[PDB]
Amino acid sequence: TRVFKKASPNGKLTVYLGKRDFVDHIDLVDPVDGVVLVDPEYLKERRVYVTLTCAFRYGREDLDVLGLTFRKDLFVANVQSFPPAPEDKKPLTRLQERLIKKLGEHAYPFTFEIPPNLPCSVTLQPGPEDTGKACGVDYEVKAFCAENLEEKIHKRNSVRLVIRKVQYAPERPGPQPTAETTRQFLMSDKPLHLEASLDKEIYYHGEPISVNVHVTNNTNKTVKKIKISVRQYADICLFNTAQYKCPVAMEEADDTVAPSSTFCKVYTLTPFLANNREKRGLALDGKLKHEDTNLASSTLLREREILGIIVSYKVKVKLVVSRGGLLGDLASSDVAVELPFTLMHPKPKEEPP
């Protein structure tokens, strides 16, 4: 098999990892195990550390400096790989012992445990004129050489490797998303009934979503238009809290429901990125560098507020209803319904991306 490696500019340090993507199984996350090869020909600093960092990267809205970003830490963990800690006595992973067997005594292991309730790797979509690193939430392993943790890290005496915390679709599909609502109007005795359902609860990226729509219009009013939309809900809990609902797919059917009649139709929508590139800030799955990634997968939670960006998706079905009559155009008569669903990648039967 193969492994990843990356060296410091001066070659003095070389980080080895088994993989870049670490799976959050909700109950537990894959541990970040690796080794650090230290070249004694160039080492003098007498202490090599490794650090796991979950950070929110962002640009300042008030600064006009191209490519300028900042990283605010949400989670930091450290391990002193060199020299081996006098207190710490921990078992090696198989990957680690294989790496030691290959590299020799100069390779010192590091193992980070990612606690639950940490944000998954999410990148917010940049605008056409962004030249800096990808903004959002990302993980990073940084191995460096210093006298102590206070020391200002020389970039040449260090090496960073971007890693991602990811989640995959649950093996067992949830209950079929259905939703209904009944609107009774002022001047009408009979109600306007809206029923909607999706074909399933779990969808994969690039997969069609089928919205079964059934309207029972027993009122005097008229449904003029039916708007279907796939909306991305993003909750961003960081310094303060922000939220948005961004439509990532939509269809405006001129389907009309006459008074005292029923209507039934299946609408099919597929969320994809190509027609959403102008929407800066849109949530995407975490990037290693600047390579394309899909619309951000749904975040799977367990059982309060979580740092970072939490993504979810809902289908909205909206009936635009005629007005007029007693209250003229003052009172809205529209009728909507919402259907939450899960948008994720299938669990890899073979290899990571």
Binding site: T1, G67, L68, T69, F70, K102, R160
Partner: peptide, 21 residues
């Protein structure tokens, strides 16, 4: 202050062999 960064300087991420056991 909050660590600033000027994105476009690092070695390209490599890849080595690992024998089976």
């Amino acid at each position: 202050r909050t660590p600033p960064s000027l994105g476009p300087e690092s070695c390209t991420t490599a890849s080595s062999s690992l024998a089976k056991d």
